[PDB]
Design an enzyme around this catalytic site. Structure first.
Site, PDB file in Angstrom:
ATOM      1  N   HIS A  94       0.911  -1.198   0.000  1.00  0.00           N
ATOM      2  CA  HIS A  94       0.000   0.000   0.000  1.00  0.00           C
ATOM      3  C   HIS A  94       0.928   1.220   0.000  1.00  0.00           C
ATOM      4  CE1 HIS A  94      -3.386  -2.596   1.265  1.00  0.00           C
ATOM      5  NE2 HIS A  94      -2.377  -3.294   1.769  1.00  0.00           N
ATOM      6  N   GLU A 104      -0.637   1.813   6.068  1.00  0.00           N
ATOM      7  CA  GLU A 104      -1.961   1.585   6.669  1.00  0.00           C
ATOM      8  C   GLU A 104      -1.808   1.701   8.185  1.00  0.00           C
ATOM      9  OE1 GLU A 104      -3.503  -2.081   4.488  1.00  0.00           O
ATOM     10  OE2 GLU A 104      -4.597  -0.335   3.746  1.00  0.00           O
ATOM     11  N   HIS A 117       2.877  -6.069   2.903  1.00  0.00           N
ATOM     12  CA  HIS A 117       2.175  -7.119   3.580  1.00  0.00           C
ATOM     13  C   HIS A 117       2.526  -8.430   2.944  1.00  0.00           C
ATOM     14  CE1 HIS A 117      -1.123  -4.042   4.807  1.00  0.00           C
ATOM     15  NE2 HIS A 117      -0.081  -4.035   5.611  1.00  0.00           N
ATOM     16  N   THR A 197      -8.944  -4.411   3.471  1.00  0.00           N
ATOM     17  CA  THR A 197      -9.859  -4.089   2.336  1.00  0.00           C
ATOM     18  C   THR A 197     -11.028  -5.023   2.486  1.00  0.00           C
ATOM     19  OG1 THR A 197      -9.049  -5.815   0.716  1.00  0.00           O
ATOM     20  CG2 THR A 197      -7.823  -3.676   0.839  1.00  0.00           C
TER      21      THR A 197
HETATM   22  C1  LIG Z   1      -8.225 -12.373  -0.513  1.00  0.00           C
HETATM   23  O1  LIG Z   1      -7.030 -12.225   0.307  1.00  0.00           O
HETATM   24  C2  LIG Z   1      -6.890 -10.934   0.844  1.00  0.00           C
HETATM   25  C3  LIG Z   1      -7.854  -9.943   0.790  1.00  0.00           C
HETATM   26  C4  LIG Z   1      -7.599  -8.715   1.369  1.00  0.00           C
HETATM   27  C5  LIG Z   1      -6.406  -8.439   1.991  1.00  0.00           C
HETATM   28  C6  LIG Z   1      -6.202  -7.049   2.549  1.00  0.00           C
HETATM   29  O2  LIG Z   1      -5.798  -7.030   3.923  1.00  0.00           O
HETATM   30  C7  LIG Z   1      -4.546  -6.508   4.005  1.00  0.00           C
HETATM   31  O3  LIG Z   1      -4.029  -6.488   5.090  1.00  0.00           O
HETATM   32  N1  LIG Z   1      -4.143  -6.023   2.848  1.00  0.00           N
HETATM   33  C8  LIG Z   1      -5.053  -6.335   1.907  1.00  0.00           C
HETATM   34  O4  LIG Z   1      -4.972  -6.122   0.696  1.00  0.00           O
HETATM   35  C9  LIG Z   1      -5.435  -9.442   2.017  1.00  0.00           C
HETATM   36  O5  LIG Z   1      -4.200  -9.141   2.595  1.00  0.00           O
HETATM   37  C10 LIG Z   1      -4.044  -9.754   3.911  1.00  0.00           C
HETATM   38  C11 LIG Z   1      -5.692 -10.672   1.460  1.00  0.00           C
HETATM   39 ZN   LIG Z   2      -2.360  -5.218   2.411  1.00  0.00          ZN
END
Ligand SMILES: COc1ccc([C@H]2OC(=O)NC2=O)c(OC)c1
Ligand SMILES: [Zn+2]
EC number: 4.2.1.1
Length: 258
Positions: A94, A104, A117, A197
């Protein structure tokens, strides 16, 4: 769902389709370093990425995801607050329109230029889709990026970005070593939270490293040339793809270090 990061479909609107947006363990959060407490019970963190097999890089319209072969225990995260074995499935970032925002999580309200992440799922649930329905289904390793010297291990990622400019584009991305994105120290903060998200599921153990990595202004500038839109649609730059800090509520952030 038509969620995104604009005025009309951004984080403040998400709760209408995804009411858990206002839940009790939402992420990200501000990390108040004066209130987080050292926890002597945390076991040592184990990042075992030597056999990681990257496959592909995908612009999904929200970020770009570097995907891994997770059909076996090739790249795993264990230890720290975690029980059992968590398999690496993908990483993404991000970032901001400007160097003063993009992360974030925040640290004493400080916003970093970007946040990485590394997403892992609990192998005791068998597959990622089952894992995201469990409170201990995912472990996300979060790493802050600041703008300074270039990160050499990032440059293969930045160089492929021209090939996946728009939503739905992917490229082969084999042999990428995610160990090149780690800082020296694995000192961390940990707390229970959520996906940042939609669908905003409350399935994540967050592990946020204290030491940021340095990337160059040129590197982050190339992130900002990506597009949220698909090919042949009006150009909307992929910037400011971060959710702001959410209420801590009834949660404690634990430090691995004193
Ligand atoms: C379908 O799998 C996913 C869906 C959303 C997230 C969101 O949560 C986050 O922390 N960043 C993101 O984009 C994800 O990442 C863990 C994985
Ligand atoms: Zn993320």
């Amino acid at each position: 769902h038509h969620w995104g990061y604009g005025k009309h479909n951004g984080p403040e609107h998400w709760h209408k389709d995804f009411p858990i947006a206002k839940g009790e363990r939402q992420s990200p959060v501000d990390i108040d370093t004066h209130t987080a407490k050292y926890d002597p019970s945390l076991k040592p963190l184990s990042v075992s990425y030597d056999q990681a097999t990257s496959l592909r890089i995908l612009n999904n319209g929200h970020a770009f995801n570097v995907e891994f072969d997770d059909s076996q225990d090739k790249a795993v995260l264990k230890g720290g607050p975690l029980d059992g074995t968590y398999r690496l499935i993908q990483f993404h970032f991000h970032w901001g329109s400007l160097d003063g925002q993009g992360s974030e999580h925040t640290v004493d309200k400080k916003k970093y230029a970007a946040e990485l992440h590394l997403v892992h799922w609990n192998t005791k649930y068998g597959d990622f889709g089952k894992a995201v329905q469990q409170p201990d289904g995912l472990a996300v390793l979060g790493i802050f990026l600041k703008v300074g010297s270039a990160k050499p291990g990032l440059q293969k990622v930045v160089d492929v970005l021209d090939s996946i400019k728009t939503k739905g584009k992917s490229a082969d991305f084999t042999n990428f070593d995610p160990r090149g994105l780690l800082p020296e120290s694995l000192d961390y903060w940990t707390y229970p939270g959520s996906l940042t998200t939609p669908p905003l599921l409350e399935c994540v153990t967050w592990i946020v490293l204290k030491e940021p990595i340095s990337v160059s202004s040129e590197q982050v500038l190339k992130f900002r040339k990506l597009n949220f839109n698909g090919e042949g649609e009006p150009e909307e730059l992929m910037v400011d793809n971060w959710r702001p800090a959410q209420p801590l509520k009834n949660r404690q952030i634990k430090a691995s270090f004193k």
